[PDB]
Design a protein around this ligand. Structure first.
Ligand SMILES: CC(=O)N[C@H]1[C@H]([C@H](O)[C@H](O)COC(C)=O)O[C@@](O)(C(=O)O)C[C@@H]1O
Ligand code: NA
Ligand code: NA
Length: 448
């Protein structure tokens, strides 16, 4: 229709960009200053997930609303097939700090062979990263100084990137397949930040000790973006979606969150904790032993009164949605299935929209509208209150009033952002692992 805007797709990442053969897992965020930040997995040896790869994090910035992009940069690189995989972007608007979080594996590990727990150990009241030598002997890193199992200082020290130094000389890296001392083989949540709108980034912070429990096997970023809560008693809280597996390997969604500008983090309950399944059964993410109720990758959006809605990848064939009245710490016992929104077991994206649509508050949603990874569709969901819960909190439902096909053919992971002009930017997996595509869409297009 006249006035509609749907730009010709541009390959924001692609074979050869930054000398990476492959790319996957898009993330896209407009900062408060108005810059677009796009992060991606730079997969160096094919499209495969960890451990069968060597994956780095890359970033591109646009300062003119997505029309042109900078030459990019690798911001996280571990050696020897130690991977960083699945990034997520959020900003603290009060301090102007941008956060990027990612899952990290030592060489040879990934979601299915991850060992149990955080890989940290408590000594006299402080968590310390554990290291292991060839014979199984366990060490701790105390302010980057390696102590043996008798709290004897050794000759070894580390840095944030895991380099291992013997008397101040680098010999290896605790994440490699060859280091004399290796970190525990498991998932780690890593955090970097930018104070200059994304131009430069800090070294990775290993926050596993605050968010990974003893009984979790894998705990990883649910890729895409986070939020900072805008209304109510938890305003200012930074919410980052995650998901984890238990001993039996079953997956459950959650968010980690910080109320002190990213300094400390906690993990909330999963919507699977005390979940009431359809016919009344009560399960828990800790004990979950069946595949059916699994909740995995997810993204979160805020309702007008500050209530949280977690959109979750799952195994029912349809979108699943959890609700939290307490800023992400727990969820209502009922997980809703929207049979208006197919979910073929793939990552999805959902963001708040800043302006009313047809007089209603709205969200924007992206995913493959099929039983396969195809038929990529952006939707406008209008929020309606439909009564209240027993506890008197409002009950919110979505009306998927506008549904627009934007990518025929292959469509997998995606990430949305609202643009300074009020339009919608989208970075999506239009190929399985090569070209990653960026387009801009106005609501006139989406409503057509
Ligand atoms: C492997 C990983 O850390 N992330 C990958 C994730 C994951 O393997 C999938 O969610 C299943 O997780 C679990 C714990 O069973 O899913 C993808 O493999 C996919 O596109 O299906 C891409 C993504 O990078
Ligand atoms: Na690397
Ligand atoms: Na560390």
């Amino acid at each position: 229709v006249e006035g509609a805007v749907k730009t010709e797709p541009v390959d924001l990442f692609h074979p050869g960009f930054l000398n990476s053969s492959n790319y996957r897992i898009p993330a896209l965020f407009k900062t408060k200053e108005g810059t677009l930040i796009a992060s991606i997995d730079a997969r160096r040896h094919g499209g495969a997930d960890a451990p069968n790869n060597d994956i780095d994090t890359a970033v591109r910035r646009s300062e003119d609303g997505g029309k042109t992009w900078d030459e990019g940069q690798i911001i996280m690189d571990y050696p020897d097939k130690s991977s960083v995989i699945d990034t997520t972007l959020i900003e603290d608007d009060e301090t102007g700090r941008i956060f990027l979080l990612v899952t990290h594996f030592p060489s040879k590990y990934g979601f299915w062979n991850a060992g149990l727990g955080s890989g940290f150990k408590n000594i006299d009241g402080k968590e310390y990263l554990c290291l292991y030598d060839s014979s199984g002997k366990e060490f701790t890193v105390r302010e980057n100084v390696v102590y043996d199992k008798d709290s004897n200082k050794t000759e070894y020290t580390t840095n944030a990137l895991g380099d291992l130094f013997r008397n101040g000389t680098k010999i290896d890296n605790i994440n490699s397949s060859t280091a004399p001392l290796k970190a525990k083989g498991t998932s780690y949540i890593n955090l970097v930040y930018s104070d200059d709108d994304g131009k430069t980034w800090s070294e990775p912070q290993n926050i596993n000790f605050q968010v990974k429990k003893d009984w979790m096997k894998f705990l990883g970023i649910a890729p895409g973006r986070g939020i900072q809560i805008k209304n109510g008693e938890h305003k200012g809280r930074i919410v980052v979606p995650v998901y984890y597996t238990n001993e039996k390997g079953k997956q459950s969604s959650a968010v980690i969150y910080s109320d002190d500008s990213g300094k400390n983090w906690t993990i909330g309950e999963s919507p699977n904790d005390n979940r009431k399944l359809e016919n009344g059964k009560i399960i828990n993410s800790k004990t979950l032993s069946d595949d059916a109720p699994q909740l995995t990758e997810c993204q979160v959006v805020e309702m007008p009164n500050g209530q949280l809605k977690l959109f979750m990848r799952n195994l029912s064939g349809y979108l699943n949605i959890a609700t939290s009245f307490d800023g992400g710490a727990t969820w209502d016992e009922t997980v809703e299935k929207d049979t208006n929104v197919l979910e073929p077991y793939c990552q999805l994206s959902v963001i708040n929209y800043s302006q009313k649509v047809d007089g209603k508050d709205a969200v924007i949603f992206s995913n493959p509208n099929a039983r396969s990874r195809s038929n990529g569709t952006v939707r406008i969901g209008l929020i309606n209150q439909v009564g209240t819960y027993e506890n008197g909190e409002p009950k919110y439902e979505f009306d998927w009033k506008y549904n627009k096909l934007v990518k025929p053919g292959y469509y997998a992971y995606s990430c949305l952002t609202e643009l300074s002009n009020g339009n919608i930017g989208l970075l999506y997996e239009g190929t399985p692992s090569e070209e990653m595509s960026y387009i801009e869409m106005n609501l006139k297009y989406l409503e057509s």
